[PDB]
């Protein structure tokens, strides 16, 4: 079951994380049943 | 899940992946309905020493 927690706050200092405590709430649990080893990260570019 | 108690109201708030309340000792305080969804508060049925 890959599970997803996600948190979206406003961040007032860009270069680091802001000293705070946030807690994720699960989005939605969904049974992928793959083996994953490595993830990758997709960026648009204009 | 199986439970002999009142069933009321419940004033707690729920986040929507929230499904059941919890008690200190391994007891379900609130259960969400499955049919619809509201959260009802579980209390046991009053008991007294005599």
């Known amino acids: 079951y890959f599970k997803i927690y996600s948190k979206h706050t406003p961040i ?6 802001p000293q705070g405590f946030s807690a994720l709430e699960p ?3 969904l049974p992928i049943g793959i083996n994953i080893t490595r993830f990758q990260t997709l960026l648009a570019l204009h | ?6 069933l009321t109201e419940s004033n707690k708030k729920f ?3 929230q499904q059941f309340g ?6 379900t ?8 969804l ?3 508060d579980i209390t046991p049925c ?5």
């Open chain 2, 22 to 27: 919890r008690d200190i000792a391994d007891t």
């Open chain 2, 15 to 17: 986040l929507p992946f």
């Open chain 2, 1 to 6: 899940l199986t439970g002999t108690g009142v």
């Open chain 1, 27 to 29: 989005l939605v649990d």
């Open chain 2, 29 to 36: 305080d609130a259960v969400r309905d499955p049919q619809t």
């Open chain 2, 46 to 50: 009053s008991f007294g020493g005599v």
């Open chain 2, 38 to 40: 509201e959260i009802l």
């Open chain 1, 12 to 17: 007032n200092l860009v270069r680091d994380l």
